[PDB]
Write a protein that binds this ligand. Structure first.
Ligand SMILES: Nc1nc2c(ncn2[C@@H]2O[C@H](CO)[C@@H](O)[C@H]2OP(=O)(O)O)c(=O)[nH]1
Ligand SMILES: [Sr+2]
Length: 104
């Protein structure tokens, strides 16, 4: 079973932790990758009720299982905070335009 289901993509907690670790490391070093400059601030326009405090940052999580290193980010993202705590996993899949819905 999937710990996180983003549309048709299946992720385990380990997939989320691996992606998060990479994203946090780049955040800490002040570097970015990709045309959208990941990781970058997640404003939470959606108003999701995360249990951890902001600021939030988003980083792509890939269905291939690899860590994002550039190129197309896909529709899924892991969201973490300044304390390297996981806020949640979200996706553009099933959401209109550039909005996000949570993966369940
Ligand atoms: N939907 C959404 N987009 C966000 C949020 N925070 C930042 N963004 C960025 O705001 C712009 C419009 O949605 C995009 O550049 C988007 O970046 P990403 O496309 O990388 O998510 C957020 O809380 N929700
Ligand atoms: Sr996996």
């Amino acid at each position: 079973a999937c710990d996180y289901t983003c549309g048709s993509n299946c992720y385990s907690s380990s997939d989320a932790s691996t992606a998060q670790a990479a994203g946090y490391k780049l955040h800490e070093d002040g570097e970015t990758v990709g045309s959208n400059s990941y990781p970058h601030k997640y404003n939470n326009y959606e108003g999701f009720d995360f249990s951890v405090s902001s600021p939030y940052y988003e980083w792509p999580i890939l269905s291939s299982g690899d860590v994002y290193s550039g190129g197309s980010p896909g529709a899924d993202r892991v969201v973490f905070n300044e304390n390297n705590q996981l806020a949640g996993v979200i996706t553009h899949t099933g959401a209109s335009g550039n909005n996000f819905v949570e993966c369940t």
